[PDB]
Amino acid sequence: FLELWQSKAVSIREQLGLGDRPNDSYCYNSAKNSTVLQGVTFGGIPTVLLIDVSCFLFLILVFSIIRRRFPWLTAIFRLHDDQILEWCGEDAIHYLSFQRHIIFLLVVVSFLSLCVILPVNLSGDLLDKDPYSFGRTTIANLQTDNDLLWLHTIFAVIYLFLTVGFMRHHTQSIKYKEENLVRRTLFITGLPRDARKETVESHFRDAYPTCEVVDVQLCYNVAKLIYLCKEKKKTEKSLTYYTNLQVKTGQRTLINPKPCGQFCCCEVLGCEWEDAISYYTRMKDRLLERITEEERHVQDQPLGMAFVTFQEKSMATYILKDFNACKCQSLQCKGEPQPSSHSRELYTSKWTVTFAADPEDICWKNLSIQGLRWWLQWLGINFTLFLGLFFLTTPSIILSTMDKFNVTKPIHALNNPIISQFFPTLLLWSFSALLPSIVYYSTLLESHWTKSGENQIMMTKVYIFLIFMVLILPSLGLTSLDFFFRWLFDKTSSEASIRLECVFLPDQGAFFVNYVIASAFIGNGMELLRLPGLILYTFRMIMAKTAADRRNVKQNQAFQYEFGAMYAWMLCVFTVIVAYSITCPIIAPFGLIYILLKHMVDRHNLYFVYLPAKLEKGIHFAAVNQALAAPILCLFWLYFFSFLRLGMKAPATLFTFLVLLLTILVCLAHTCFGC
Numbered sequence: 001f002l003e004l005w006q007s008k009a010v011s012i013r014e015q016l017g018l019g020d021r022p023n024d025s026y027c028y029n030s031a032k033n034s035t036v037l038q039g040v041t042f043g044g045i046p047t048v049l050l051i052d053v054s055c056f057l058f059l060i061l062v063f064s065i066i067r068r069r070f071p072w073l074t075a076i077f078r079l080h081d082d083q084i085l086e087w088c089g090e091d092a093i094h095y096l097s098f099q100r101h102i103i104f105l106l107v108v109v110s111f112l113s114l115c116v117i118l119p120v121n122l123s124g125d126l127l128d129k130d131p132y133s134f135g136r137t138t139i140a141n142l143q144t145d146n147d148l149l150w151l152h153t154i155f156a157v158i159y160l161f162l163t164v165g166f167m168r169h170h171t172q173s174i175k176y177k178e179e180n181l182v183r184r185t186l187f188i189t190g191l192p193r194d195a196r197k198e199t200v201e202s203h204f205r206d207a208y209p210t211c212e213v214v215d216v217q218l219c220y221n222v223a224k225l226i227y228l229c230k231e232k233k234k235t236e237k238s239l240t241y242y243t244n245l246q247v248k249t250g251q252r253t254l255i256n257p258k259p260c261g262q263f264c265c266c267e268v269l270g271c272e273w274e275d276a277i278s279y280y281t282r283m284k285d286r287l288l289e290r291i292t293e294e295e296r297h298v299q300d301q302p303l304g305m306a307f308v309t310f311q312e313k314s315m316a317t318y319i320l321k322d323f324n325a326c327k328c329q330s331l332q333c334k335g336e337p338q339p340s341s342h343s344r345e346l347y348t349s350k351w352t353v354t355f356a357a358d359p360e361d362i363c364w365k366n367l368s369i370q371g372l373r374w375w376l377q378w379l380g381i382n383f384t385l386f387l388g389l390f391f392l393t394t395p396s397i398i399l400s401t402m403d404k405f406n407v408t409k410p411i412h413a414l415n416n417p418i419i420s421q422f423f424p425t426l427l428l429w430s431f432s433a434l435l436p437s438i439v440y441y442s443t444l445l446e447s448h449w450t451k452s453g454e455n456q457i458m459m460t461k462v463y464i465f466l467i468f469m470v471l472i473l474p475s476l477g478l479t480s481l482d483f484f485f486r487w488l489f490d491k492t493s494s495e496a497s498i499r500l501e502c503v504f505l506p507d508q509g510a511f512f513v514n515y516v517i518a519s520a521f522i523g524n525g526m527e528l529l530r531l532p533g534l535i536l537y538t539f540r541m542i543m544a545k546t547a548a549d550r551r552n553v554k555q556n557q558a559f560q561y562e563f564g565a566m567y568a569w570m571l572c573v574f575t576v577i578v579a580y581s582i583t584c585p586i587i588a589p590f591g592l593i594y595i596l597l598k599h600m601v602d603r604h605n606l607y608f609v610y611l612p613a614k615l616e617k618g619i620h621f622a623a624v625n626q627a628l629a630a631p632i633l634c635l636f637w638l639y640f641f642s643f644l645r646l647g648m649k650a651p652a653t654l655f656t657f658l659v660l661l662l663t664i665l666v667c668l669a670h671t672c673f674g675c
Helices: 009-015 042-069 073-078 083-087 091-113 117-122 149-174 197-207 223-249 276-296 314-320 372-400 423-446 451-470 473-489 511-529 531-542 563-579 587-605 618-628 630-645 651-665
Strands: 185-189 216-218 306-309 352-355
Touching: 042 511, 073 587, 083 091, 091 149, 091 563, 091 587, 091 618, 117 149, 149 618, 149 630, 149 651, 185 306, 185 314, 197 216, 197 306, 223 276, 372 423, 372 451, 372 473, 423 451, 423 511, 451 473, 451 563, 451 618, 511 531, 511 563, 511 587, 563 587, 563 618, 563 630, 618 630, 630 651
Parallel strands: none
Antiparallel strands: 185 352, 216 306
């Protein structure tokens, strides 16, 4: 077993083929006393799998040590599906129900596919019948002008029925009704600077005499006011803490105002030490002067928006569903707001009214970036984030595929199986794990307004970036790179043109399998251990003023579960698994094992220190409709693969075009007139 893995197998391929193909002449036939360069021995999956198993065992041992100082499989064997309801939160029940639904769907599709898809992939002769190859089970060993794609298409479209049925069953199980009765206030923008409260109330009385308004909340430029209030609150908290420390100890302390100034232990210019109390009083007085000036400066300039509240609901909806495209009749028909003498200078046509959330948590300090400045910030921040993402995906792929830049030397005695298979996967996974922090900082800089939509837009952006970073971007990247080595290696200007009938993802498309295994074993162990949560905890313990100050660290050691980040991560993994189900079916059992391990790890971690949820059901609905879109992406990827492998002349391409057209046609009916 162990002997016939890399000792004898590496020499079998070196003494076969020898060319002389009578009439087939399949792609990647032979070479100069060697095989093709793209030929990889099973993708090197056994060695990396064994290394991951050993590292997971070591990480389990160190986790047991850390738990002892702060196996325990009996707990996992003991937990049931009731105590969570008796003592934990309510959203945990729905989270576990969704997890059960997804694992059931994955196991059902795996058991339905692993018995039928494998023989049809193995029934091929394009890979010269390599015994220990890995690409024989993928679409690479498929005949072009053959009718085996009909079963593939039928099963890929029964994906649609199965997923829709499972999602509908999950929706009926959660059975949450709509409860969003917050419509007493309408958000109106585009207000001219000249118009006043009297003007707007007179306009409202002249337009709609069937309602009453007792107060108008016209927004001001008090975003700077709230920012100064937050800075003053932080300064007061620091001053109170240092005063308490002074009372407790009796000695003066010195601080360094420069960022990261705690490491300046020597007399270095730029790291001067100043009295904490006197300095705190200095910025306290400076901030006091700033707020005193800005309070008088508040009325000098408005922002162009106001809040108008009501007392009833039917009248409020009647007026809130009148003079904008979405609320009025479909396809932007002529809207007729009530005319008056105060419309030309108020720009009712240019007005845009949307739903308003609870004013208690609305970010007042983040309301000064409205107008075209919002679009400018979006196009200047997310675009440069995409540029940085391009820079991030450039060299992970570059170093992962550094052994195929040279088209000569088919001996393939230079590549090291250990390298170029674990390190690139690890750095890509680490960058993916650090991406939520970068997107969190980007969102904080962007300063979204509505708290009720903060989590929704955060999860949407995280999922979009994760997709365009791991699924569609790297795939197209290495496909283009493989086409590049094809163009400079195989049949370019010798006797014919480029042959596109045998192109595929290099390394037998094992990069995604390696990523899945890394997120399944070493990534799962890393997530359980919380390597950078541990780093942050160690840094927090290191930074201090006294020795016995363990009271304030245990109060914030526990952290809220990142619902949006975890949902986006799991949904991205499931979508990539679904999309790469027609391609590389061997990834299905690996994904099943990953889901099993993640289920066990989440069940174990949801009982020790994890806090109960405080989040609403809109996130659950967003997750449901996000999981609903996976088969659409799978069909799109199938169409892309069909177009890349075969030309449009075949009727199969026309059939795929028609099915894609119908799927895209039924995609927005739930958005235009749906809720």
